[PDB]
């Protein structure tokens, strides 16, 4: 009897050609699925809205962590989203400070994660070669 699992992990997502993206307000980009947890059965993805979700967030990129599937009724997890700048460092980090309750099909995240004009201003180095690199660190409650 020994058992183990991945309880905390960071997913690096790069969106190529961020400018020439076809999505407008309220339209989504889903990342590929990534696994964690007992038996590799927690299935997660990221959901971004490049030009915001709604009226309150029209000037922003919206960023969410989605629990696609899980075996029990819930997963309690903390999360943190950040951006990889051109000098290779993590910036603009925001965390959920406590754990959030995830069910299969439920997401949690930041409707106003960052201003599009900040992101598009090339004195911030956040879009080198027009590639947007996002980081999501997820920490699952045991």
């Amino acid at each position: 009897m020994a058992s183990g699992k991945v309880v905390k992990f960071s997913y690096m997502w790069t969106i190529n050609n961020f400018s020439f993206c076809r999505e407008e307000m309220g339209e989504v980009i889903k990342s590929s699925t990534f696994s964690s947890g007992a038996n590799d059965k927690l299935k997660w993805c990221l959901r971004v809205n490049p030009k915001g979700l709604d009226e309150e967030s029209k000037d922003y990129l919206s960023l969410y962590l989605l629990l696609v599937s899980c075996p029990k009724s819930e997963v309690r997890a903390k999360f943190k989203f950040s951006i990889l700048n051109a000098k290779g460092e993590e910036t603009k980090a925001m965390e959920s400070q406590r754990a959030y309750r995830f069910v299969q099909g439920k997401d949690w995240g930041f409707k106003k994660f960052i201003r599009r004009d900040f992101l598009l201003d090339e004195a911030n180095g956040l879009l080198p070669d027009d590639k947007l690199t996002l980081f999501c660190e997820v920490s699952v409650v045991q």
């Binding site: 959901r47 969410y64 959920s96 439920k106 949690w108 995240g109 930041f110 409707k111 960052i114 201003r115």
Partner: peptide
């Protein structure tokens, strides 16, 4: 206010 810290679910 380049970032806002409020957390919400998919709405």
């Amino acid at each position: 206010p380049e970032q806002d810290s409020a957390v919400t679910s998919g709405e």
